[PDB]
């Protein structure tokens, strides 16, 4: 409703870097808000694509941003008569970024790993990896929970059980308020998907450069399964956190598995032990239900509600035709330990191939009326297919059915405007929460400032 579409701020990264692929707000220890931007195809020293991270201070004018440097060299360790290898070429550093406290976590889901032993090997695979930074102090750490030292032959003997070689950890990520890093790894367990969790403090206190393989005793990973419903489900394609069990001492995880059950799609809500509390099933095969998930209380009852995006949902048209437009589902959390039940509201895109629901961002209370609001991206929507972001306001019964505001992409065709969104943070400190929108196709980020309601 009251975002300002007239006076925007633009940040930019290098050509071809995909600057804006991921982003988040970051508070330094002095309470000053900045923007962390992932750019997964940024060139490294080797002249090859490795990815990179940028830390943009707030400036109405925008502009270029200081790099946030991470070690981009391949590592080799000859230990225990084995050879451990990391490969950072095309690792996609910055394919996801998240901030917690004074720490930034930037992930490289396609970082590769191998282990050689004489003529045998583990196989060169994308275990993925996460880089952690404390910008003010300069401290650095890494977290790569899916790395192993088991040889290929052993996996064959066990029918490829507990196979974490293709995890792509950091594909998605989120941090709990208590500082527990949670990584989605959709390739985990031979493409079932898995989650990996570890306190940020313990990652920092256990990490030493050069080791590559070390124990994090407090870490916790989800489990393999022999239920074919889960096969190739990409459980962990998206993740979020919230409160869904009535115990405020505990954080619950929301996990998207967009291809669960032969591409039906699913989203699950679990406790921090990965015990399932709810399962939401997709409505239509191949719609990618679970591509994106968002948690926020939209109807002002103090209970977190769930939003699920299915960007490839095909709406029924006249003459028994189907039109791919994308769809978003709202599930209101009931009072008590009851089941979420059917969707309370269905929001459906209008532009063919627009991919409405690709990203869903809590905005907090944008218009300051007592109900939290959301923004929904359609990266290829709008009358000209350049991309649109639609704002929906909360209300006592959930969300409004019609958007209060529509932001048209200020970039050229193919920018993927809205692929990434982040709201709910007041960056200019004017008392209204603001919205940042990534457009990696144009290597830029756009900031929309909220203003007093006209």
């Amino acid at each position, epitope marked *: 409703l009251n975002l300002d579409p007239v006076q925007l701020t633009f940040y930019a990264g290098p050509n071809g870097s995909q600057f804006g692929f991921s982003l988040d707000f970051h508070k330094d220890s002095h309470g000053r808000v900045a923007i962390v931007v992932g750019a997964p195809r940024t060139l490294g020293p080797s002249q090859e694509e490795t990815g990179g991270v940028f830390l943009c201070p707030w400036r109405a004018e925008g502009g270029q941003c200081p790099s946030l440097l991470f070690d981009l060299r391949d590592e080799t360790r000859n*230990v*225990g008569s084995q050879t451990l290898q990391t490969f950072k070429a095309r690792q996609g550093l910055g394919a996801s970024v998240v901030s917690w406290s004074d720490v930034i976590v930037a992930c490289a889901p396609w970082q590769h790993w191998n282990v050689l032993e004489k003529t045998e090997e583990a196989e060169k695979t994308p275990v993925g990896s996460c880089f952690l930074a404390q910008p003010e102090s300069g401290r650095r750490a890494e977290y790569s929970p899916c790395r192993g030292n088991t040889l290929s032959r052993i996996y064959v003997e066990n029918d490829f059980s507990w196979d974490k070689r293709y995890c792509e950890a950091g594909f998605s990520s989120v941090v709990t308020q208590a500082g527990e890093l949670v990584l989605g790894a959709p390739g985990g367990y031979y493409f079932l998907g898995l989650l990996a969790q570890a306190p940020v403090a313990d990652i920092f206190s256990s990490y*030493r450069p*050069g*080791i590559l393989l*070390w124990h994090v005793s407090s870490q916790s990973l989800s489990f393999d399964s022999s239920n074919p419903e889960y096969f190739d489900g990409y459980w962990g394609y998206s993740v979020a956190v919230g409160e869904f069990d009535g115990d405020l001492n505990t954080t619950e995880y929301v996990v998207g598995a967009p291809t669960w059950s032969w591409t039906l799609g699913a989203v699950e809500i679990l406790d921090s032990y990965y015990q399932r509390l709810h399962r939401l099933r997709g409505e239509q095969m191949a719609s990618y239900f679970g591509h994106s998930v968002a948690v926020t209380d939209v109807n002002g009852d103090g209970r977190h509600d769930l939003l699920v995006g299915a960007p490839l949902y095909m709406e029924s048209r006249a003459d028994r035709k189907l039109a791919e437009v994308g769809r978003v589902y709202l599930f209101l959390q009931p009072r008590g330990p009851h089941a979420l039940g059917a969707p309370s509201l269905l929001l459906t895109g209008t532009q063919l191939y627009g991919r409405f629901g690709s990203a869903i961002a809590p905005l907090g209370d944008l218009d300051r009326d007592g109900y939290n609001d959301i923004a929904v991206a359609a990266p290829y929507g709008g009358p000209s297919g350049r991309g649109q972001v639609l704002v929906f306001l909360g209300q006592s019964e959930g969300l409004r059915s019609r958007p209060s505001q529509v932001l048209d992409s200020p970039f050229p065709t193919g920018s993927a405007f809205g692929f990434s969104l982040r709201g709910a943070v007041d960056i200019d400190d004017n008392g209204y929460p603001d919205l940042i929108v990534g457009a990696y196709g144009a290597n830029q980020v756009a900031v929309y400032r909220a203003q007093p309601v006209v």
Partner: antibody
Amino acid sequence: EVQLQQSGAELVKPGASVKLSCTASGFNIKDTYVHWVKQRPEQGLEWIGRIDPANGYTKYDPKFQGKATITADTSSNTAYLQLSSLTSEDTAVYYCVRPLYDYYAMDYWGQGTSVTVSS
Amino acid sequence: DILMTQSPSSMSVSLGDTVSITCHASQGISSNIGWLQQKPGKSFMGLIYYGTNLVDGVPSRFSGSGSGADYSLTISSLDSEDFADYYCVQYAQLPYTFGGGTKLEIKR
């Protein structure tokens, strides 16, 4: 607190066998590699081998092949070192060891078990 | 097998002194070395892992260094508790192998 609690001193006659124990306390034995080490006053320290209690896979220094056998019992959070056909050469103190962070390191040690061979 | 040659086998030093213990390997082990302490009649305590990293809880007066095939353990300002046996261990290759040991003794 991570602690390796080993069994008591052993007195064994030549040619006999003996089985030493290493019980994990404050953690699960499946967490890391568990190594066994032999110490003598003159010859010093010698790595015997290791096991991954999670799967039972072992490694040995070929010098102890046929003499030492390492096993684990996750049910009782314990790792074992079996010495067979004992000679005076086997009189020594035996330690079990596990790493702290580094997968391959040798940081935490049990208090040691004395084995004395005599008829 | 890799041979670890530790020097010296013993040293007579004084409280408050700074002392360095060295270890030479028959081939490059790329910091894959640990340092161990054994007080009189006691068991072992880990000091260093991977060349330079203090085990959690180890006094700051201890430090490790080196590269290739040569490494050092250095104790700055000896405490009374530091008079003990020290050993290096390499785990670059199976079998793991140990140095011959160094005994710190009181000078008089």
